[PDB]
Structure 1
Amino acid sequence: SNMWVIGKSKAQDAKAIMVNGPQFGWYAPAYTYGIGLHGAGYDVTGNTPFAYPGLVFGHNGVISWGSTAGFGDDVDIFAERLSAEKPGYYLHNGKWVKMLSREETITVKNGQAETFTVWRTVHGNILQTDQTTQTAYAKSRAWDGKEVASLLAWTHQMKAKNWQQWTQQAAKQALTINWYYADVNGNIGYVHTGAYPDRQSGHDPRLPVPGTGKWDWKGLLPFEMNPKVYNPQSGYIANWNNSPQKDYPASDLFAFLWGGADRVTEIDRLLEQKPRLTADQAWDVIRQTSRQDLNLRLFLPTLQAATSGLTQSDPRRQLVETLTRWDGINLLNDDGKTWQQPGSAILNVWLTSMLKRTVVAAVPMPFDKWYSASGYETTQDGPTGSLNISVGAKILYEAVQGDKSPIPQAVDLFAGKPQQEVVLAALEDTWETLSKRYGNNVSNWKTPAMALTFRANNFFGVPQAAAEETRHQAEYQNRGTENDMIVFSPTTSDRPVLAWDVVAPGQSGFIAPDGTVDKHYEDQLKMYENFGRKSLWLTKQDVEAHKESQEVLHVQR
């Protein structure tokens, strides 16, 4: 999910511009739901996932807000000590405490029902147990007990009119989420929200801790510790799920790292390129980042140094020269199915080979399979989410930086060989694989583009639409599930705010019993593909001016 917020000192023809591209995958009907709420203290417009009571993306005419996933570490596992005799108990602070437990029956259509039990300790629900060691693992979330309050903080924040009121509600949102702020006066802000544990000294948050008492969290850290900035010296706030701040630790997931190679640099380069940006230029960053290969920037210097002493007829070098002419923007050919330049296919095959020769080789099976993906893996339907730089590739980037990397190289991933020898061997593998399929003339290589599927199954793998409701888009775009832009104090209008969004396939998912599809079932689908957008209305006059229908209800509680 990415976000760029541009303040007073970087905005051209406006005081503040917010562009948000939450990335949840692509679905039919649409992941988010458009909604305007006018009354009881509320005056808002925007769209929100699953029609939440609170709007994750929108504005109320004075301030605007948006989110990206935080990925802080707010979950630790507690190894509980069980007893072979006295089962259902666990040792905690010198006594044998009884577990909470509940029985559940799963009714099954055309099957027999199944019942099982769920167990919970003071640290949380039990994930798994090891009868052999008499250990049970409890997953403990820092936000446990604050789920409903987080839903409400996302609702009440829609009434804030300034930074002070807005941060009051940010302090109640307990999930690890980045929150962003913009206002009519051009102020901008960011808060890495959520509840983080106050851990005992010596607790390494990447691994389990004994649940017997001594490792218990002390409480939760205060909101003053949450990374946050207001009106940054730079003039802008950019995020693509990268680190909030210097020295902030990331989720404990083995596949997730915040390192020197990070995709947010792609957004930074575009925002630093121009002294000021207009709304049209802020929106255009969605189209460039959507199409940008993320590995070229990282490994092009390494490839260039390695092939520098090679002759012009050496195919390894020809591969590097094709990459050197490329800006890394992928564009479809006229056929709607192949890319115009073979760069991504080259990097893919190179990187797979380099990982297999370095990171993969230093890790015992079966953990070596966690570090072999190049980050280009997809299927015929295309990626299910955003494209990123793979873990293996972030680890290999640190290794190719040498003593310029802050990470001690405990094992030499190049195993005694000079880097360039390993780079050239991988490049020979690449040439062998690709030339065999496409031939020797690199200029006529037509390599397969990634496509984009709006799935009929939601993100759990459950049907939310019939299989025929699936929609196909020829160009994969590394961009939000929806995009929304808010422009505050436009010099080009008399309106104090202007906002747009795009919720594809459409606002409605309704299909009548006779098979007649609603009028707003797919009217946003082509707009999405061409980077278009529709206006969001907020004032009464604008709503009335664009009304297509009206319904009045009279109800009393």
Structure 2
Amino acid sequence: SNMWVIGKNKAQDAKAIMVNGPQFGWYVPAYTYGIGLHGAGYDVTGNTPFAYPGIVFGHNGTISWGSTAGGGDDVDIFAEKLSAEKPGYYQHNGEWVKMLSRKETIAVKDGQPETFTVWRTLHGNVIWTDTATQTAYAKARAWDGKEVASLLAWTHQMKAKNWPEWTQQAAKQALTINWYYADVNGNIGYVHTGAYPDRQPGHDPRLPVPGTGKWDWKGLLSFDLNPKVYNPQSGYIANWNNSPQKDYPASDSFPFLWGGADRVTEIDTILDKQPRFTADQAWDVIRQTSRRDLNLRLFLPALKDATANLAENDPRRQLVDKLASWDGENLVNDDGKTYQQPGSAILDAWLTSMLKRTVVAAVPAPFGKWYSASGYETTPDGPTGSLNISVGAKILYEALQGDKSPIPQAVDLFGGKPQQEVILAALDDAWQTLSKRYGNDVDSWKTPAMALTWRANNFFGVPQAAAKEARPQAEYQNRGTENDMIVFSPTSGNRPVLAWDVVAPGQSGFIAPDGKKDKHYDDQLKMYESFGRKSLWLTPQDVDEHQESQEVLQVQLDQGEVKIVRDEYGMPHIYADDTYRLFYGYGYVVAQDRLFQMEMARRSTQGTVSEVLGKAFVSFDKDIRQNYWPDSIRAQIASLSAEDKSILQGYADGMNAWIDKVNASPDKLLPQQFSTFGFKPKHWEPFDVAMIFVGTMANRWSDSTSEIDNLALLTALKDKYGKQQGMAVFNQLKWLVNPSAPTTIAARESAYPLKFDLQNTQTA
């Protein structure tokens, strides 16, 4: 997910420009949903994942906002001490506390039900039980009990009109998410939002902690500690899942690192090269970064050095010369199947061999395979997500920097041999594999282009469309699933704010019972591929001028009225006078456009897919039910103010108003996929609505930990290198902080004050 916010001092013909490209993968129907809300204090336009009541990507005429995943460490694992004689009890503060438990049965269409029990302790749900050590590992999220509040903070921030008002909602968003701000006066800002634990001294957040009491969190850190910047000296805020600020620690996941090698530098390079950007140039950064090879910039200096004494007759030299004449941009040939230059295939083969010889060799099996990927891994279907610098490559980059790197190399990744020797040896392996395939002349190689697929299964692996709806795209583009731009105070024109977005394949996922696709089923698919965009309307004049349909709806609760106006791309605009009615119109239009997708997202987020699709989804259903506690979500809803509750209730009731019309005349209104898969849509509740957010936002982007795997790795590293050196190798592969990491907030602005204790920890 990427973002670039350009302020007053860096914007040309405008006061501020915001460009967001969140990366969620490619699906049909679209991952995000375009929506306009007007009334009850709301006047907002934009698009949002899974049609959440809160619009994640948008603006309100005064401020614009967006987000990328935060990548912080908000999840810790508590190793609970089990009892030999007491089943279902654990030790906390000298006593034997009983575990909460709940029994679940997964109903299976044409199959056998599957029963199991989910366990929960004061730390969280139990994710794993090791009988040998009598340990139950419990997952503690700093945001547990704040799921519904995080959804409502995203909804209320839509009404903010300045920095203090917006940061007040940013403080109530408990998930690890980067939030961005821009306004009509040219002010830009950034907050790395979330609830983060206040840990005991010597708590290494990369490894599990005993859950007996001595290591329980002292509570949560204050919002004052969260990295934030307002109008940075640089005049821009750029992010591509990189570090928010100097000394700020990343998530404990072993593949996730923030080091000297970071893809955000690709955006920083473009933004620093010129002093001012127009709206069209800011948007063009998408085209540029989408085609950028991320490894050329990192390894070309070492490759030129290793082949400096070679003449042009040497094949290893011919490979580096081909890389040295390349601009790093990948373009597809007229055939639609191959790249114009072979550089990425050369870097892929070289990196794969380099990693086998360096990082993979140093790490004992079966942990070596964790650092073997080159970052180019793809199938004929194309990459399912973004392309990044791999974890192995990030560690290899530190070793290549050597002296320049702040990471102590506790083990020489080059195993005694000089690095030039290893670099030429990997180049020879790359030459051998690539010449066997394309012949001995590098100038004639037509290497395969990465393709893209708009998947008919959601990110969970569950159908959200018939398989036949999957669409191919010849060019893979390392860009957002959607891209949106907001331009504040443009010098040209009679509008104080301009916005655009692209929601492909289209605004609608509706396919009629006879197979007829809606007019807005795929009318944005070609616009996406060609880096085009469509206008986002906010004012009633713009909405009414570009309208295509207009209808009134009578809310079933109070016979009140809601006006729905759809634009030329099918994007609905809701007009209502109270909170309940507003969200009722929203849920109603979601049910008209994305019923089959939302119903499948509902079953995916609650683990009820097998009920309608069969035994294939049983392990998926079980794992979803094991990863949440329904009573906590229901308690969070039950304790909402009447205003916050009307948002969820209105939305659910609005969906039910359309579902009833659908079930009254299925032969004309039932989405075709309900007939293809053999079931009917049913009513939604505020629970269902909250669980779409929890299951697809909190669980997908804010629930990442690999502490148990980290412990297994550290245990093997101590076995190989000894207790002392093994821990120092762990600090070289999975460092807590790396000061050379490119950061969204400049070091000049501020740094993370919280320093961590290395000596004496839970691993002593």
TM > 0.5: yes
Higher strand share: 1
Which residue number corresponds to residue 75 of structure 1?
75
Task: Map 1:124-273 onto structure 2 (within 5 A).
Answer: 124-273=124-273
Which residue number corresponds to residue 604 of structure 2?
none
Which residue number corresponds to residue 24 of structure 1?
24
Scaled by the length of structure 2, what TM-score is found? 0.73
Which residue number corresponds to residue 753 of structure 2?
none
Q: How many angstroms apart in 2 are the aligned matches of 1:459 and 1:419?
A: 40
Deviation at 1:391, TM superposition (A): 0.3
- Cα RMSD between the aligned structures? 0.5
Deviation at 1:442, TM superposition (A): 1.3
Q: How many angstroms apart in 1 are the aligned matches of 2:413 and 2:133?
A: 35
Report the residue type matching 1:438 in the other structure.
Answer: Y
The alignment status of 1:36 with 2:36, answered yes or no, reads yes
Q: How many angstroms apart in 1 are the aligned matches of 2:507 and 2:439?
A: 47
Deviation at 1:86, TM superposition (A): 1.2
Which residue number corresponds to residue 360 of structure 1?
360
Which residue number corresponds to residue 331 of structure 1?
331
Which residue number corresponds to residue 515 of structure 2?
515
Report SS of the residue matched to 2:341.
Answer: coil
The alignment status of 1:87 with 2:83, answered yes or no, reads no
Q: How many angstroms apart in 1 are the aligned matches of 2:6 and 2:57?
A: 16
Which residue number corresponds to residue 552 of structure 1?
552
Task: Structure 2: state its 5+ residue gaps.
Answer: 559-764
Deviation at 1:29, TM superposition (A): 0.3
CA offset digits 1:419-468 (Å, max 9, x no partner): 10111111111111111111111111000000000000000000000011
Q: How many angstroms apart in 2 are the aligned matches of 1:86 and 1:554?
A: 58
Higher helix share: 2
Deviation at 1:156, TM superposition (A): 0.2
CA offset digits 1:12-31 (Å, max 9, x no partner): 00000000000000000000
CA offset digits 1:204-232 (Å, max 9, x no partner): 00000000000000000000000000000
Deviation at 1:114, TM superposition (A): 1.3
Report SS of the residue matched to 1:101.
Answer: strand
Report SS of the residue matched to 1:485.
Answer: strand
Report the residue type matching 1:410 in the other structure.
Answer: A
Deviation at 1:554, TM superposition (A): 2.2
Report SS of the residue matched to 1:399.
Answer: helix
Report SS of the residue matched to 1:339.
Answer: coil
The alignment status of 1:437 with 2:437, answered yes or no, reads yes
Q: How many angstroms apart in 1 are the aligned matches of 2:512 and 2:413?
A: 60
The alignment status of 1:382 with 2:382, answered yes or no, reads yes
Q: How many angstroms apart in 2 are the aligned matches of 1:17 and 1:405?
A: 35
Q: How many angstroms apart in 1 are the aligned matches of 2:66 and 2:104?
A: 38
Which residue number corresponds to residue 14 of structure 1?
14
Which residue number corresponds to residue 114 of structure 1?
114
Task: Map 1:411-422 onto structure 2 (within 5 A).
Answer: 411-422=411-422
Q: How many angstroms apart in 2 are the aligned matches of 1:346 and 1:113?
A: 51
Deviation at 1:339, TM superposition (A): 0.2
Deviation at 1:100, TM superposition (A): 0.4
Report the residue type matching 2:128 in the other structure.
Answer: Q
Deviation at 1:84, TM superposition (A): 1.1
Number of equivalenced pairs: 557
Report SS of the residue matched to 1:403.
Answer: helix
Deviation at 1:528, TM superposition (A): 0.3
Which residue number corresponds to residue 749 of structure 2?
none
Which residue number corresponds to residue 423 of structure 1?
423
Q: How many angstroms apart in 1 are the aligned matches of 2:320 and 2:554?
A: 70
Which residue number corresponds to residue 52 of structure 2?
52
Report SS of the residue matched to 1:333.
Answer: coil
Deviation at 1:112, TM superposition (A): 1.4
Scaled by the length of structure 1, what TM-score is found? 1.00
Which residue number corresponds to residue 370 of structure 1?
370
Which residue number corresponds to residue 310 of structure 1?
310
Q: How many angstroms apart in 2 are the aligned matches of 1:245 and 1:415?
A: 33
Q: How many angstroms apart in 1 are the aligned matches of 2:87 and 2:439?
A: 67
Deviation at 1:553, TM superposition (A): 1.3
Report the residue type matching 2:480 in the other structure.
Answer: G
Q: How many angstroms apart in 2 are the aligned matches of 1:244 and 1:170?
A: 15
Report SS of the residue matched to 2:224.
Answer: helix
Q: How many angstroms apart in 2 are the aligned matches of 1:272 and 1:404?
A: 23
Q: How many angstroms apart in 1 are the aligned matches of 2:112 and 2:269?
A: 58
Report the residue type matching 1:118 in the other structure.
Answer: V
Report the residue type matching 2:360 in the other structure.
Answer: V
Runs of at least 4 residues of structure 1 off by over 2 A? 554-557
Report SS of the residue matched to 1:447.
Answer: coil
Which residue number corresponds to residue 467 of structure 1?
467
Report the residue type matching 1:463 in the other structure.
Answer: P
Report SS of the residue matched to 1:422.
Answer: helix
Report the residue type matching 2:387 in the other structure.
Answer: L
Report SS of the residue matched to 2:297.
Answer: helix
Which residue number corresponds to residue 669 of structure 2?
none
Report SS of the residue matched to 1:68.
Answer: strand
Q: How many angstroms apart in 1 are the aligned matches of 2:554 and 2:334?
A: 56
Report the residue type matching 1:533 in the other structure.
Answer: R
Task: Out of 135-144 and 426-435, give the one that drifted further.
Answer: 426-435
